[PDB]
Design a protein around this ligand. Sequence first.
Ligand SMILES: CCCCCCCC/C=C/CCCCCCCC(=O)O[C@@H](COC(=O)CCCCCCCCCCCCCCC)COP(=O)([O-])OCC[N+](C)(C)C
Ligand SMILES: *[C@@H]1O[C@H](CO)[C@@H](O[C@@H]2O[C@H](CO)[C@@H](O[C@H]3O[C@H](CO)[C@@H](O)[C@H](O)[C@@H]3O)[C@H](O)[C@H]2NC(C)=O)[C@H](O)[C@H]1NC(C)=O
Ligand SMILES: *[C@@H]1O[C@H](CO)[C@@H](O[C@@H]2O[C@H](CO)[C@@H](O)[C@H](O)[C@H]2NC(C)=O)[C@H](O)[C@H]1NC(C)=O
Ligand SMILES: *[C@@H]1O[C@H](CO)[C@@H](O[C@@H]2O[C@H](CO)[C@@H](O)[C@H](O)[C@H]2NC(C)=O)[C@H](O)[C@H]1NC(C)=O
Ligand SMILES: Nc1ncnc2c1ncn2[C@@H]1O[C@H](COP(=O)(O)OP(=O)(O)O)[C@@H](O)[C@H]1O
Ligand SMILES: *[C@@H]1O[C@H](CO)[C@@H](O)[C@H](O)[C@H]1NC(C)=O
Ligand SMILES: *[C@@H]1O[C@H](CO)[C@@H](O)[C@H](O)[C@H]1NC(C)=O
Ligand code: ALF
Ligand SMILES: [Mg+2]
Ligand SMILES: [Mg+2]
Lengths: 365, 957
Amino acid sequence: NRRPKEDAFTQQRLAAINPVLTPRTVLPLYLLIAVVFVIVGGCILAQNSKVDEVTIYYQDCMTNATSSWSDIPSEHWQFVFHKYKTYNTAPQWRFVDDESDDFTKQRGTCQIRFTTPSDMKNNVYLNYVLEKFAANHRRYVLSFSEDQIRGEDASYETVHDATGINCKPLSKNADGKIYYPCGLIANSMFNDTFPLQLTNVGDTSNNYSLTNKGINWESDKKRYKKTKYNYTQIAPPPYWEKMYPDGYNETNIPDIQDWEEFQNWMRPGAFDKITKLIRINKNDTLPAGEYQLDIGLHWPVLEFNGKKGIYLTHGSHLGGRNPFLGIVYLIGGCICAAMALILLTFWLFGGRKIADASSLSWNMK
Amino acid sequence: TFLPKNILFQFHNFANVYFLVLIILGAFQIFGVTNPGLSAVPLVVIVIITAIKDAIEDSRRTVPTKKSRISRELNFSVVINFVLLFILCFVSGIANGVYYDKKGRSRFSYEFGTIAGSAATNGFVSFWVAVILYQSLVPISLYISVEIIKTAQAAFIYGDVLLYNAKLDYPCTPKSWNISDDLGQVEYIFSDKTGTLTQNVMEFKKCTINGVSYGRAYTEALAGLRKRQGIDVETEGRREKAEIAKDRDTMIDELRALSGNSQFYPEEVTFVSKEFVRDLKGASGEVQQRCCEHFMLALALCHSVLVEANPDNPKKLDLKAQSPDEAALVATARDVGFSFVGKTKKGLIIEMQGIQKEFEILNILEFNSSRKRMSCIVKIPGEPRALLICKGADSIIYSRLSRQSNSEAILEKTALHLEQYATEGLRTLCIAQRELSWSEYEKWNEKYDIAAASLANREDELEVVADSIERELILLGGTAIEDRLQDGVPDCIELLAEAGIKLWVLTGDKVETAINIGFSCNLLNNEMELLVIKTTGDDVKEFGSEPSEIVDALLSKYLKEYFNLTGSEEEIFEAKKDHEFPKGNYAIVIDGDALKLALYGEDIRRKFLLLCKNCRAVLCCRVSPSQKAAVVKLVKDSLDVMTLAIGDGSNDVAMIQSADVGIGIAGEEGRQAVMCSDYAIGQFRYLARLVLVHGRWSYKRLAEMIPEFFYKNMIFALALFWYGIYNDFDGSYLYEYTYMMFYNLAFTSLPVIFLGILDQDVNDTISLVVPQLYRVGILRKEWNQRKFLWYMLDGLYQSIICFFFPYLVYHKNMIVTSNGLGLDHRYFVGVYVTTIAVISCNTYVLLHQYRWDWFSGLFIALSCLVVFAWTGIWSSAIASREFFKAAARIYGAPSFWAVFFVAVLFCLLPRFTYDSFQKFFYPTDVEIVREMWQHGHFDHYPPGYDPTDPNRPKVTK
Ligand SMILES: CCCCCCCC/C=C/CCCCCCCC(=O)O[C@@H](COC(=O)CCCCCCCCCCCCCCC)COP(=O)([O-])OCC[N+](C)(C)C
Ligand SMILES: *[C@@H]1O[C@H](CO)[C@@H](O[C@@H]2O[C@H](CO)[C@@H](O[C@H]3O[C@H](CO)[C@@H](O)[C@H](O)[C@@H]3O)[C@H](O)[C@H]2NC(C)=O)[C@H](O)[C@H]1NC(C)=O
Ligand SMILES: *[C@@H]1O[C@H](CO)[C@@H](O[C@@H]2O[C@H](CO)[C@@H](O)[C@H](O)[C@H]2NC(C)=O)[C@H](O)[C@H]1NC(C)=O
Ligand SMILES: *[C@@H]1O[C@H](CO)[C@@H](O[C@@H]2O[C@H](CO)[C@@H](O)[C@H](O)[C@H]2NC(C)=O)[C@H](O)[C@H]1NC(C)=O
Ligand SMILES: Nc1ncnc2c1ncn2[C@@H]1O[C@H](COP(=O)(O)OP(=O)(O)O)[C@@H](O)[C@H]1O
Ligand SMILES: *[C@@H]1O[C@H](CO)[C@@H](O)[C@H](O)[C@H]1NC(C)=O
Ligand SMILES: *[C@@H]1O[C@H](CO)[C@@H](O)[C@H](O)[C@H]1NC(C)=O
Ligand code: ALF
Ligand SMILES: [Mg+2]
Ligand SMILES: [Mg+2]
């Protein structure tokens, strides 16, 4: 015949619960969330206050520093040591000009001396910071070629005419060669030469040694590959022509697989501040003392008022030092507790009857 | 021609053409920023799905353009969403131009940029790239999701097993699969009577021949009238049925003693008049004997009954008829001794008390629901004569009567007898005959031939020639046939009156019969004033002089007396606003003659409508199909409301098509009202089930699913606008492209679709036990535009939270990893944002579901798991260029999880606290009914409960 199939689905009788939110069931949930979130916020704020960091901005080292050691203005450095809340002890810097380099926009060497009154346990990250450098714009952030990242010897059209991510403005020079790392992302790299150690000023017998290995994810070496170009099909980008003046030849074409600072730079920072790891030390604790960092200024940042700096930290489990997560967990817990108390107050004031068939809108009129 | 027609029918839309322009703007006019090849997968997938559904419809037709109210309000909400998207694009373009104008930036150094003079050009290209960035703020899957929800709700209406009528083998087949949410806003029901509320199975009970009343029967409607009067029913009825059985036995004996009749079968004799056969012999004289003989001869001749064989008895005849009235008349005419057997090539052959003599039926003026009568012309042998036997409604026949050739005593006696029978509750007919001379008949026959042979609407020509020929008649009597209510119409009408629905009954049968059925089916009750609007002379002579003014006076008097209004556009504009079920317990009973006058002029129509907007019950009687349609159109146009029109027949067809939800009943008359209808139930009692359960559910479902859709789109598509602040509204995407497409495809669709398909506030048993929950749909409380705007505001606030919580976890030093390595790419910040957004919108849908079934919960859980699993599956493949290990790098960072949990809390705490404050201190009727259900006041009702079924177990309490 035509009788429909009787089944819990087609008759809409699926097994189910019907959660009515009465006070006796919601107020305990509110209080449970409140207590859990307040506990977690307290633990996060505790374990985050213990994070110590050192930030120094050295963009003004060519014009504000002298040839002898002088204190850094207070607007540049920012020390945070939890055991020492009142530790000013301003750092000092000294500019060692370099008259051979003819790139007078930024040249020389900024020597920075800081003093850490406590340790940094066994895993010390030295990043660099860049402010007001816009690496999130539409044309810039898409100007690279994943045929060259992945190792291929992409021809001119594969590199310049590709859809989406294509090194369009920097695809080929005048001579007819393909800029090897093409696009505005690789061409505009960060150029300062950070040192492979923190010179110990106090006792120069033991310098703190930093490395540039393991500063990027080990899984990035599946995506970045040594190029298969031929030193006659590639030239360096227009801004790598102080690093490779004679061009590319048999032994200088960069291996972008082990070049981990490149793999850090080709990951454009989403926002206006850019903090990229550049030196790590995963072996030794950094004991208290006065250290010295010899940065070799190369990268111009004053033509756009940008700042560049260092940021030495040990870190945390949740990243660096940021009071936000604990603050907002405490705020969430306190808001849930306040709403539970408010519902309890109004429910002991104007508490109505629950299953009252007399409160129905038709039994009242 | 499938594909071109389908693509045209689709790109008649603005979302489809918007996405086509997006594909062309990313490909042919490519600025460079897009993955153009796969940017079409959303559009291609949705157009493929729509083409498949159109193929389904075409196959179903291989096996009327009505739109619900929420569809029109949905178009308005779509327009508001596009206005918001344009405002976003405008702000983006303005701010990007303002920025590109500034004269010291990183781009004059490291981005090989120049000031393109009058940077308004770059601001313009920025607007046009923002239009492509916010491609998710467009409702693109909204229409396919609403069609999926509506088709699934209609499939459940079909596959419901409590809407299946096992006798006719007819499930409630929805003829329109897209207005199922109108059954939850139905406010008026315009119902026929004799096939809708009463089963069209007639038993001939009484008759009046030559002013003499015959027949005796104590029926259920008569018992109801006696109870209404006050006298006890069972005490009298026992004795009355005893006497009826005795009288029937004696009458069968006397019919057997009269003569030998072939088709006389006493096992189904329904006429019970002993005095009829007592007068057939000698009682009231030879004049009365001949009168009764001629009356029964007219009954056995004037009809359209076809004669066939019984498969059981080869001799027995079945008397199949298209009109149950004719069926009953011919059955009684054959029982009394005037058997109608066979139908020769000319006329009919009639057995008159044993002797067969053939008659000649020359013209059959067939019955029409607009003529309200029928007649046939038979030859009387000798110069032979003509006899026009005319049969139909009593008012029509009385209008078409002669003034000189009538006793005017039989006239008033038959009128009083028909009034008595109609008040008792029987369908009254009048039988009249015309003696025609040969010359008059020849004249009229040639007129009839030249009218029938004509093309170009022969109907009106036949009507005019019949109205000319039938103008002179002589009355010989009237009959009465009993019509029993359907099974469970009192219970269904009680449900539909509790639910706040006003039931109008548009009959074509007598005023007194309509009122009797109203009292019997609980449309009207005792202590109810029947504000009758009759324009009848007995009161016309006192009210005024001439009609079309007596009805105006009556409407104005009843208005100014019973309510404090008068017919005026001010009153009409004030009454358009209110939808409450009226109080006052009044009922209008307006005949068709007064309905014509009350519908003529605009001022009197306004008066009549303001009078009938009150008065819970209305009974329009002696109404033609045109007037049925006119009343429905009047109440649906003025005081714009939702109307349902239920019935069967060619007249209810015009009533059904002219209403929002027209329901047709598979009745004894052919299925002509089932075809031109939207649903098709087997009996009236299923209207309560259909309307309350399925329509209320479908209204609640769509009214919750649509704002939820706009909100879930807004969260995701506005986190991109928020990111624009931190790249100067330049047009770099915060999200991966697969994220941008899969969000509305897979990450968020099935929760809202299942909220629309499978959600139930309270189950069917409680929907029918507390039917007053329907009043919210009647009042339009579930779906406003204020509700959609509150949902969009919540989506905007939650988008703020979803973006600026990951942003605030980064902003300090951009180090969020446990091992100091970098996560600062905007695709990884977008993973943060997206995971928060998807889980919050899915948990919003879950918290706003009323019933947590395992199906809905399972697919909510799977939508969340799919976000996580697609990230884990697309990362680990190097085909994701810059996204190569976002899974292992992000899901392994405790900052991700800290942000995840507190941002989901902050997304859901405002709304959940508002819901808690509501459900505590201003609980709606459904929330109070659910708190009663939890404690178990509805624990003794069975699972499949229908209080509109006679053979149901009596409930415990
Ligand atoms: C899930 C994984 C992801 C899915 C992807 C997302 C998709 C979203 C999923 C949505 C699922 C919604 C399913 C609705 C359930 C219907 C049940 C029902 O009432 O059947 C009843 C009526 O059967 C019919 O009348 C069928 C009519 C076909 C119309 C389309 C039905 C589903 C509409 C959905 C959209 C239409 C398709 C649009 C293109 C997709 C019972 O039928 P029966 O028992 O067989 O009676 C036979 C007995 N007899 C033979 C004696 C008579
Ligand atoms: C380190 O990076 C620096 C910026 O990324 C880069 O500076 C760029 O140096 C090139 C030449 O070496 C300059 O190129 C232009 O210089 C002037 C401009 O008028 C012209 O005379 C030249 O012909 C050429 O057009 C760039 O201007 C300069 N970058 C900026 C922003 O000014 C250093 O060269 C890099 N140094 C090392 C050692 O890698
Ligand atoms: C620690 O670093 C200092 C500075 O780089 C090293 O001292 C230099 O040693 C070289 C070796 O001949 C001399 O030419 C320089 O003049 C020294 N400079 C200074 C400032 O002392 C020192 O050698 C390093 N530590 C060890 C153990 O080698
Ligand atoms: C920390 O110690 C590890 C080994 O314990 C050093 O790793 C080696 O570094 C040298 C430097 O050239 C490499 O040649 C070796 O291949 C490395 N070995 C391994 C196993 O990685 C690391 O250099 C030390 N780091 C610091 C900052 O001193
Ligand atoms: N077969 C018939 N022959 C003569 N009159 C009829 C017939 N059927 C119905 N009528 C008359 O028509 C009137 C109703 O016609 P209709 O418009 O069909 O109303 P309803 O909706 O009650 O059937 C009744 O008063 C009845 O007396
Ligand atoms: C050097 O530093 C001093 C101290 O803040 C400041 O006043 C001065 O402007 C700086 N010199 C230049 C050239 O900026
Ligand atoms: C290759 O080029 C580099 C320039 O960086 C140069 O120092 C080196 O000597 C060249 N090698 C040969 C073999 O010429
Ligand atoms: F509803 Al009818 F004839 F009026 F079937
Ligand atoms: Mg019929
Ligand atoms: Mg009829």
